[PDB]
């Protein structure tokens, strides 16, 4: 029995879909991330709305990699005016702090059977960047990622 995520009634979870393995590596090295402008605003609102009352988790996956590659917690609001050209999209300016939790590869086949009711019942593995996960589905995804060997 692992009932750790029971009573966790606060927290929000988003899918991060990256085109670049280099961005993932930079993120792990420096504990930062940046999304599109749309994605950043979505993450920033969730972070600011949380008021430190619980975590904002990010479930990372490189497009076409066939797997998720880990989990980080969002650790600051978005700073929208930072040095350009640090990411795979050279136009991106903007940055927020993250803290990586799991760095491990989890095949999509381990997660494909969990579906998102806010995204037309599609598999969580078919999500787009900054797709939000309902908390009840996010608990199941996290337990799977933590347990995978």
Swiss-Prot record:
Domain comment in the entry: The disordered regions have the ability to interact with each other and to 'phase separate' into liquid droplets within the cytosol following binding to mRNAs containing multiple m6A-modified residues. This leads to the partition of m6A-containing mRNAs into membraneless compartments, where mRNAs may be stored, degraded or used to transport mRNAs to dendritic arbors in neurons.
The protein's name: YTH domain-containing family protein 2
Interaction with m6A-containing mRNAs: region residues: 9-149
Subunit structure: Interacts with CNOT1; interaction is direct and promotes recruitment of the CCR4-NOT complex. Interacts with YTHDF3. Interacts with RIDA/HRSP12; interaction leads to recruitment of the ribonuclease P/MRP complex.
Function, as annotated: Specifically recognizes and binds N6-methyladenosine (m6A)-containing RNAs, and regulates their stability. M6A is a modification present at internal sites of mRNAs and some non-coding RNAs and plays a role in mRNA stability and processing. Acts as a regulator of mRNA stability by promoting degradation of m6A-containing mRNAs via interaction with the CCR4-NOT and ribonuclease P/MRP complexes, depending on the context. The YTHDF paralogs (YTHDF1, YTHDF2 and YTHDF3) share m6A-containing mRNAs targets and act redundantly to mediate mRNA degradation and cellular differentiation. (Microbial infection) Promotes viral gene expression and replication of polyomavirus SV40: acts by binding to N6-methyladenosine (m6A)-containing viral RNAs.
Modification note: Ubiquitinated by the SCF(SKP2) complex, leading to its degradation.
Residues bound to RNA: 17-19, 23, 33-34, 63, 87, 92
Induction text: Following heat shock stress.
Tissue: Highly expressed in induced pluripotent stem cells (iPSCs) and down-regulated during neural differentiation.
YTH domain span: 11-145
Location of the protein in the cell: Cytoplasm, Cytosol; Cytoplasm, P-body; Cytoplasm, Stress granule; Nucleus
